[PDB]
Nucleic acid binder design. Sequence first.
RNA 1: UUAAGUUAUUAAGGGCGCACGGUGGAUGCCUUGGCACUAGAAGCCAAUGAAGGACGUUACUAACGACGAUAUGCUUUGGG
RNA 2: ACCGAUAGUGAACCAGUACCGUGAGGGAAAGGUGAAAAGCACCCCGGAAGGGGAGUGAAAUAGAACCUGAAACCGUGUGCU
RNA 3: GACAAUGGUAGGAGAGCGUUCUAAGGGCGUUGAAGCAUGAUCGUAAGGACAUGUGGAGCGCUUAGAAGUGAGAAUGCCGGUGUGAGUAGCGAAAGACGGGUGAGAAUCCCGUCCACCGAUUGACUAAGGUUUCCAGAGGAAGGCUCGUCCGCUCUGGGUUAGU
RNA 4: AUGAUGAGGUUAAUAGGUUCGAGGUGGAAGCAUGGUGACAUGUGGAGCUGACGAAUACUAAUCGAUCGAAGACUUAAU
Lengths: 112, 119, 45, 44
Amino acid sequence: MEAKAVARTIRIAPRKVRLVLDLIRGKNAAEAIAILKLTNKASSPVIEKVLMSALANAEHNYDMNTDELVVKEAYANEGPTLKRFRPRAQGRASAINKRTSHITIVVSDGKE
Amino acid sequence: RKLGRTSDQRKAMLRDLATSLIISERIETTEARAKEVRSVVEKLITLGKKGDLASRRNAAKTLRNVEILNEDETTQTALQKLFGEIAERYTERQGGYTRILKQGPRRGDGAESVIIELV
Amino acid sequence: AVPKRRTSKTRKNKRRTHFKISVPGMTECPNCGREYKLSHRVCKN
Amino acid sequence: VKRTYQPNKRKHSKVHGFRKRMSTKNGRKVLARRRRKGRKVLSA
RNA sequence: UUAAGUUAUUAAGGGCGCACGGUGGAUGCCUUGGCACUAGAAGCCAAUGAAGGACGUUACUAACGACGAUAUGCUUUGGG
RNA sequence: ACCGAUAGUGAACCAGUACCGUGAGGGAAAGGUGAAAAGCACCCCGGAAGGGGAGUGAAAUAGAACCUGAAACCGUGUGCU
RNA sequence: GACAAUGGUAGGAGAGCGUUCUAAGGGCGUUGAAGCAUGAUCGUAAGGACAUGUGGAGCGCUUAGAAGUGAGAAUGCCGGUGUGAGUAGCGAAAGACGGGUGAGAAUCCCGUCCACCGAUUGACUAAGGUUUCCAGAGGAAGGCUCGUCCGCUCUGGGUUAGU
RNA sequence: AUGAUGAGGUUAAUAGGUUCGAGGUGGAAGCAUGGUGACAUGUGGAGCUGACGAAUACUAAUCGAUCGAAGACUUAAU
Ligand SMILES: [Mg+2]
Ligand SMILES: [Mg+2]
Ligand SMILES: [Mg+2]
Ligand SMILES: [Mg+2]
Ligand SMILES: [Mg+2]
Ligand SMILES: [Mg+2]
Ligand SMILES: [Mg+2]
Ligand SMILES: [Mg+2]
Ligand SMILES: [Mg+2]
Ligand SMILES: [Mg+2]
Ligand SMILES: [Mg+2]
Ligand SMILES: [Mg+2]
Ligand SMILES: [Mg+2]
Ligand SMILES: [Mg+2]
Ligand SMILES: [Mg+2]
Ligand SMILES: [Mg+2]
Ligand SMILES: [Mg+2]
Ligand SMILES: [Mg+2]
Ligand SMILES: [Mg+2]
Ligand SMILES: [Mg+2]
Ligand SMILES: [Mg+2]
Ligand SMILES: [Mg+2]
Ligand SMILES: [Mg+2]
Ligand SMILES: [Mg+2]
Ligand SMILES: [Mn+2]
Ligand SMILES: [Mn+2]
Ligand SMILES: [Mn+2]
Ligand SMILES: [Mn+2]
Ligand SMILES: [Mn+2]
Ligand SMILES: [Mn+2]
Ligand SMILES: [Mn+2]
Ligand SMILES: [Mn+2]
Ligand SMILES: [Mn+2]
Ligand SMILES: [Mn+2]
Ligand SMILES: [Mn+2]
Ligand SMILES: [Mn+2]
Ligand SMILES: [Mn+2]
Ligand SMILES: [Mn+2]
Ligand SMILES: [Mn+2]
Ligand SMILES: [Mn+2]
Ligand SMILES: [Mn+2]
Ligand SMILES: [Mn+2]
Ligand SMILES: [Mn+2]
Ligand SMILES: [Mn+2]
Ligand SMILES: [Mn+2]
Ligand SMILES: [Mn+2]
Ligand SMILES: [Mn+2]
Ligand SMILES: [Mn+2]
Ligand SMILES: [Mn+2]
Ligand SMILES: [Mn+2]
Ligand SMILES: [Mn+2]
Ligand SMILES: [Mn+2]
Ligand SMILES: [Mn+2]
Ligand SMILES: [Mn+2]
Ligand SMILES: [Mn+2]
Ligand SMILES: [Mn+2]
Ligand SMILES: [Mn+2]
Ligand SMILES: [Mn+2]
Ligand SMILES: [Mn+2]
Ligand SMILES: [Mn+2]
Ligand SMILES: [Mn+2]
Ligand SMILES: [Mn+2]
Ligand SMILES: [Mn+2]
Ligand SMILES: [Mn+2]
């Protein structure tokens, strides 16, 4: 129907990816790519590549007209997180969380 | 009067940035350094536009040594190019032989990049 | 000094309403295609 | 600062060696015990 | 329109309900391993070099076993 | 009328081993795809990772970090506010 | 059918709910068991059913028997995940531009200029450490950022003595 | 601090430059002369000069996008 694509365990924290994701959500696919290319945060290129792949198999698979396509929905979910430490003063170690996330984008036409 | 580093290191980077771009007409830098360097460069170009040994020995006080490779054979000096090359171009021109072009943010630190070029 | 009571999901989100990023000011390249940031260079074309 | 433990190959092998264990009844008792637990290292 | 009075829409964001997801590894089912006994065998190995190891052996070999320089096996009797 | 993976041995996994101590010594965690590897040919976006089709299968909303997949916790949509 | 009584801590007395296993009887189950989820269901309570989804092989009921039989608190033990919060920190120090490379460079290579140590940040070697040394590839994780790079990864090599 | 306030955005003096100037310093370099020289005088209130003051579009404020009214009901009064 109205196509989607997903990237899994990207190693950016979900809070961080979500910031870029909010600007893109609900927007026309073209300007979505624009806002993505100009927004200078770290997650922007990653999210870009995901939206590109989404529109790509929205055409090669479901044969929609790419230009009428809209970013119907985008989000990021907590992935598994790598756990590391960080030695400190007095010889105590302390926690560090290298978190990762599943980014999802879904583009669209009309209802049918 | 913008800074970045310490008062002397700032001097050094400014002479370095100024000598460069005389060496090669245009360079890429932070917007802040571009706005600082433009003054030092137009000023060196007026010392060049005067022509006297006074203002030459004067341009020498700031400008770096360098080497410069002229097209085909032979070697100039950044000084020699300031007085014996660039100044020839800008005699009829009034003030302001410089422009900053706004490249936008770079990856590593997101500093805003700009090109700074001659005419 | 330490927090004396944990923040609730509600308090923490209310504290975050202003923590967005603004959509960049942007403009179409005249007859070049890719859009660029405002009052910034048009690139190599 | 000068931490405890400056390594020394000779001194480590004297005092803590197979042979040094063997040299007294108790060292043999030690090797006995470690053999009983089945340490992959035993005395070293 | 003028005066007096009365109401509402807005949600930056929040709350309740619901839907769809993610994380996480409880719960159910499973058992290669354990746990306590029963009946019978057996209760010693060692200078003819032990117990326990070290280093090696395979087309390719890091690890475990097996084997030792006749090395990932040799002869021999029987089973298959 | 014993345990069923926080149990039962410390050890159901190449355990007295990662790891820790100069040493004597201390001492873990870690089981499960499927009936069968049939473990996704090929096309597509991507440097790759990862993914959408197309397929194997009763099932992959069983795809390997793989049975079931609770709660905390994180999100997207919105009916009343 | 009238009548009486029924607040309650320590504590005594009574009657019951549910969990695992066992025995006997009687049943359910791939036309879908347990489990999980949802619901406007039922009983005086603990608690019991029914329908739908999920799940993919086991499980109730009756009578009795036996217990590792019921958790919210022990600065309890293990595991997961929050809050603090996009907060503290990123470990003494001078760097700039040009040119390469690359999917991608403040951070890798080359270049010029600048700078810092110079009884030492230089050159040897003992202790200790044991392939970190060299070459070509690589970039998941390690590196407090980045990475095309590395004391990291893969593949292949490298230590020669009568004195 | 950031935002905020204010001065401007080509029909333009908002910054930078350029040419002038205030103020600061105190007599640049090069040459000439006088000395054996270290130095002195002349050329010449010289030269240089961040923030301060004018003038001047030479450089840069380009193109462009976003947001923002159509005016509720009742009663009395023209
Ligand atoms: Mg032991
Ligand atoms: Mg009124
Ligand atoms: Mg209004
Ligand atoms: Mg909103
Ligand atoms: Mg006997
Ligand atoms: Mg019993
Ligand atoms: Mg000790
Ligand atoms: Mg491609
Ligand atoms: Mg490709
Ligand atoms: Mg399919
Ligand atoms: Mg599939
Ligand atoms: Mg029951
Ligand atoms: Mg039933
Ligand atoms: Mg079903
Ligand atoms: Mg229920
Ligand atoms: Mg009973
Ligand atoms: Mg507790
Ligand atoms: Mg902040
Ligand atoms: Mg190594
Ligand atoms: Mg290596
Ligand atoms: Mg003389
Ligand atoms: Mg004067
Ligand atoms: Mg508009
Ligand atoms: Mg009214
Ligand atoms: Mn320490
Ligand atoms: Mn100094
Ligand atoms: Mn990067
Ligand atoms: Mn929010
Ligand atoms: Mn031991
Ligand atoms: Mn017996
Ligand atoms: Mn004998
Ligand atoms: Mn033996
Ligand atoms: Mn035979
Ligand atoms: Mn165990
Ligand atoms: Mn389990
Ligand atoms: Mn199997
Ligand atoms: Mn693939
Ligand atoms: Mn099929
Ligand atoms: Mn898992
Ligand atoms: Mn599963
Ligand atoms: Mn009572
Ligand atoms: Mn009463
Ligand atoms: Mn009692
Ligand atoms: Mn069926
Ligand atoms: Mn059961
Ligand atoms: Mn039944
Ligand atoms: Mn109990
Ligand atoms: Mn608890
Ligand atoms: Mn805990
Ligand atoms: Mn704070
Ligand atoms: Mn702070
Ligand atoms: Mn900070
Ligand atoms: Mn550092
Ligand atoms: Mn290139
Ligand atoms: Mn270099
Ligand atoms: Mn020095
Ligand atoms: Mn050594
Ligand atoms: Mn070491
Ligand atoms: Mn090396
Ligand atoms: Mn890194
Ligand atoms: Mn304003
Ligand atoms: Mn004018
Ligand atoms: Mn003056
Ligand atoms: Mn405009």
